[PDB]
Amino acid sequence: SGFRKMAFPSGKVEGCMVQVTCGTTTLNGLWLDDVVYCPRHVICTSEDMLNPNYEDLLIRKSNHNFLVQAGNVQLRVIGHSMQNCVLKLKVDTANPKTPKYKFVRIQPGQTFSVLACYNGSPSGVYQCAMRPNFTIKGSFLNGSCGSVGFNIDYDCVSFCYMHHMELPTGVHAGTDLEGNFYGPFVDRQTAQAAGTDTTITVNVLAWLYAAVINGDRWFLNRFTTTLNDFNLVAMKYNYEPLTQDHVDILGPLSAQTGIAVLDMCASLKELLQNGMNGRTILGSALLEDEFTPFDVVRQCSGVTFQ
Amino acid sequence: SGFRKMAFPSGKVEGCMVQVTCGTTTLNGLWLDDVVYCPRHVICTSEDMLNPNYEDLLIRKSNHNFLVQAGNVQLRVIGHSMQNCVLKLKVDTANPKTPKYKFVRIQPGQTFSVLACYNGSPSGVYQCAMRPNFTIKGSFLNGSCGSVGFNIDYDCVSFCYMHHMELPTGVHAGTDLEGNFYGPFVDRQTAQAAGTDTTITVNVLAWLYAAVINGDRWFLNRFTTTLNDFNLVAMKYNYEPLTQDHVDILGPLSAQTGIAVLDMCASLKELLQNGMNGRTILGSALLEDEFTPFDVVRQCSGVTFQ
Ligand SMILES: *[C@H](O)[C@H](C[C@@H]1CCNC1=O)NC(=O)[C@@H]1[C@@H]2[C@H](CN1C(=O)C(c1ccc(Cl)cc1)c1ccc(Cl)cc1)C2(C)C
Numbered sequence: 323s324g325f326r327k328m329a330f331p332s333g334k335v336e337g338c339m340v341q342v343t344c345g346t347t348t349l350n351g352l353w354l355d356d357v358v359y360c361p362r363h364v365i366c367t368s369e370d371m372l373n374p375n376y377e378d379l380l381i382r383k384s385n386h387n388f389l390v391q392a393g394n395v396q397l398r399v400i401g402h403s404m405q406n407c408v409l410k411l412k413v414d415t416a417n418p419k420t421p422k423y424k425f426v427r428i429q430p431g432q433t434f435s436v437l438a439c440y441n442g443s444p445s446g447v448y449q450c451a452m453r454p455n456f457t458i459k460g461s462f463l464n465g466s467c468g469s470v471g472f473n474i475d476y477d478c479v480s481f482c483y484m485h486h487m488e489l490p491t492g493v494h495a496g497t498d499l500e501g502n503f504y505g506p507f508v509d510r511q512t513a514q515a516a517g518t519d520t521t522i523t524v525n526v527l528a529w530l531y532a533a534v535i536n537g538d539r540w541f542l543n544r545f546t547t548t549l550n551d552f553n554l555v556a557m558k559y560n561y562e563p564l565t566q567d568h569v570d571i572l573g574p575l576s577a578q579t580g581i582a583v584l585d586m587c588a589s590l591k592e593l594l595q596n597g598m599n600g601r602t603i604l605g606s607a608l609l610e611d612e613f614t615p616f617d618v619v620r621q622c623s624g625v626t627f628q
Numbered sequence: 629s630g631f632r633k634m635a636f637p638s639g640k641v642e643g644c645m646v647q648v649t650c651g652t653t654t655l656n657g658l659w660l661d662d663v664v665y666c667p668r669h670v671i672c673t674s675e676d677m678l679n680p681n682y683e684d685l686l687i688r689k690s691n692h693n694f695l696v697q698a699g700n701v702q703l704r705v706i707g708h709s710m711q712n713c714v715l716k717l718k719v720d721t722a723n724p725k726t727p728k729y730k731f732v733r734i735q736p737g738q739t740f741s742v743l744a745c746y747n748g749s750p751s752g753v754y755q756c757a758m759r760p761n762f763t764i765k766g767s768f769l770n771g772s773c774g775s776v777g778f779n780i781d782y783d784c785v786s787f788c789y790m791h792h793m794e795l796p797t798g799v800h801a802g803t804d805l806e807g808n809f810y811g812p813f814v815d816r817q818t819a820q821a822a823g824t825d826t827t828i829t830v831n832v833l834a835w836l837y838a839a840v841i842n843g844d845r846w847f848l849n850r851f852t853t854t855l856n857d858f859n860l861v862a863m864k865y866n867y868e869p870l871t872q873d874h875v876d877i878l879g880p881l882s883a884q885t886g887i888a889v890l891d892m893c894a895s896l897k898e899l900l901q902n903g904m905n906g907r908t909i910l911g912s913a914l915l916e917d918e919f920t921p922f923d924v925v926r927q928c929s930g931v932t933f934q
């Protein structure tokens with residue numbers, strides 16, 4: 323037993339991480355086969371980043387301007403192109419550590435692991451959720467751009483995020499690996515704002531089921547509720563609407579615990595209206611919303627990756 | 629900016645993890661050079677585990693009884709010995725992925741990363757602290773024994789924990805890599821209990837400094853306090869005494885923020901006496917104690933590992 327915010331083992335991604343320097347900008351790149359992917363704002367100077375014209379900036383660049391460091395071995399860039407907000411640097415060497423992979427774009431409410439990197443060297447790994455407002459609550463300092471987010475399924479790494487910037491509230495914005503931003507953000511150094519967030523209701527319910535599985539039962543009740551009546555309470559407390567597909571997705575957890583989904587909704591209702599009255603759930607005094615039903619099933623049953 | 633519970637990149641440890649099966653017990657082993665380390669209770673049957681005599685049990689074993697799986701390659705065991713509560717299985721192949729390493733034993737209050745493993749395959753990575761009562765609040769299911777805890781310093785893996793068992797409160801107990809248990813626990817299937825825990829005061833203060841660095845300031849005050857007067861409050865709320873060495877260790881964070889250590893103690897005092905009044909600190913509604921001053925400095929400055 324026990325329930326922890328758990329990242330995927332990072333080894334497969336560590337072997338892909340490189341350093342990209344151009345001018346006086348250094349960031350991280352992702353090296354897969356013979357391409358290095360990195361944020362396109364590596365081509366920017368300080369006065370470029372205020373409102374850059376990246377097509378103009380890129381045509382003025384040369385292959386030799388891009389210094390790519392794979393550990394202590396320099397990678398010769400032999401071609402370069404832009405795809406949306408990422409650069410694709412063609413190098414003369416295929417990464418022998420290239421895992422099997424996919425470029426996927428995730429939905430708000432879904433989670434992934436971030437391998438935070440500086441100077442092409444991994445620093446730490448942690449779990450993030452894509453917020454409903456398309457930001458992520460990460461831990462990123464200068465130099466972390468090009469760090470990626472990913473999930474692992476069996477032996478296959480699904481890359482879903484590349485880091486680009488921090489917003490004024492201290493949350494983080496970036497792209498999928500096709501270079502398309504999550505949310506209404508641009509890689510331009512100009513006042514942008516996240517936009518109002520909501521709590522991921524289906525995830526809170528999943529975490530309540532994790533708690534029950536692990537012996538925390540004090541918030542359970544005999545009460546039940548209808549889906550419609552629950553959603554009137556959810557809307558008031560700035561929670562996302564719960565759909566019938568959410569109910570269906572929670573089915574396995576409901577069956578394992580023997581607590582009907584709508585019964586757990588009644589419990590969440592009371593927690594929302596009453597608070598926790600000094601008690602905790604899985605070591606938290608807040609309702610936690612960055613575990614998906616999948617995350618709970620993985621951890622509370624024991625899935626691995628090879 | 630941002631502050632997350634962050635584990636070390638796990639790649640170096642992933643390359644060491646193997647499957648050890650003996651009889652109908654399967655667990656994980658740690659393969660370094662030509663030795664596989666694993667919990668000695670792998671030699672136990674169901675009626676053995678109730679109160680086993682491990683020396684008797686081991687002399688009845690043969691090298692060929694130990695099936696070691698390194699991925700899809702079988703490792704031939706050529707010798708075996710017991711060291712305290714771990715077994716050392718001598719194999720005919722040195723692990724070519726052996727990182728530089730050390731076997732260290734950590735102190736209560738210190739943190740480490742756990743690579744949770746099943747059937748020799750890594751499942752997830754997360755950060756733990758050694759509680760004052762020598763337990764850890766982990767996430768471990770059947771089959772996870774032999775998973776290790778570690779820190780990484782530059783290129784060197786300091787192994788500090790091997791997982792052995794869960795206690796009746798759902799917390800976890802294990803050994804250092806010399807096979808010596810943390811705390812007053814034995815690898816015997818008989819009623820044991822954790823013993824009363826305390827909150828790691830110096831870590832809470834470190835986390836309060838992390839919060840200030842990241843813009844959370846509402847708990848700050850003009851008040852100050854003496855170390856003695858603080859410790860009278862700490863004792864009441866079941867917090868560990870703060871020592872002058874703790875104050876010294878917090879010096880850098882104090883200097884970065886410009887908040888004297890004893891001033892932050894005055895803030896913690898009010899938080900302990902008043903609670904949080906509906907507010908949060910770094911996304912938590914509880915005072916968090918599993919970040920060390922080192923952890924805060926690493927994350928809020930950007931140290932990597934190669
Ligand atoms: C890439 O290494 C870097 C990572 C950020 C630094 C601090 N936290 C990060 O995640 N990204 C950037 O430097 C981007 C790129 C120029 C500016 N920028 C920023 O994140 C700064 C910034 C972003 C957005 C706006 Cl509208 C203004 C400035 C920034 C934000 C917050 C802090 Cl604390 C420092 C710097 C860019 C092309 C957007």
Ligand SMILES: *[C@H](O)[C@H](C[C@@H]1CCNC1=O)NC(=O)[C@@H]1[C@@H]2[C@H](CN1C(=O)C(c1ccc(Cl)cc1)c1ccc(Cl)cc1)C2(C)C
Nearest residue numbers: 669768769770771772773792793794815816817818819820
């Ligand atoms: C090793 O894979 C396994 C890991 C534990 C299973 C559940 N959580 C774990 O961390 N460890 C064990 O199976 C140990 C070894 C025999 C019994 N055991 C236990 O952890 C069970 C147990 C421990 C201690 C006592 Cl006093 C009685 C039983 C145990 C505890 C809790 C649960 Cl939920 C299941 C099983 C052993 C030699 C101690």
